Structure 1
């Protein structure tokens, strides 16, 4: 998932099971004060949900990951 943060503007999160791609696009707007191009979603085989949200071309993914604190 670090390859998706560094190459593309793709932030990867583990989201709660009841979220539906509008509650994730709006969460990253409200939590991180950014804009989101597009959210993708899969349900991991350990039964949790993983969301490939994607920042849009002027927000950078490395700066948001460093302000969060997982580098």
Structure 2
């Protein structure tokens, strides 16, 4: 789950997650939150573990 630039689309979110975290993402679903910010749910492939990558980023 990510806070995303409001001007970003699913293509850019996919590409940026791939280039930042060296993971392969399966699907991207975005919404605009009632506070006016973009929220992205990026589901990765079965090869990668979201908890693994979250612990790599730093938040447990």
Q: How far apart are residue 58 of structure 1 and its match? A: 1.2
Cα RMSD after superposing both structures: 0.4
- Aligned-partner Cα distance in 1 for 2:47–2:20: 18
Residue deviations 1:6-53 (CA, integer Å, cap 9, x gap):
xxxxxx000000001000000010000000000000000000010000
- Aligned-partner Cα distance in 2 for 1:20–1:68: 22
Q: How far apart are residue 66 of structure 1 and its match? A: 0.2
Q: Which has the higher helix share?
A: 2
The list of structure 1 runs, each at least 4 consecutive aligned residues, that deviate by more than 6 angstroms after superposition, is none
TM-score by length of 1: 0.83
Q: How many residues align?
A: 60
> Gapped runs of 5+ residues in structure 1?
1-11
Secondary structure of the residue aligned to 2:51 is helix
Q: Which residue of 51, 55, 58 corresponds with 1:66?
A: 55
2:9 corresponds to 1:17: no
Q: How far apart are residue 59 of structure 1 and its match? A: 0.3
TM-score by length of 2: 0.98
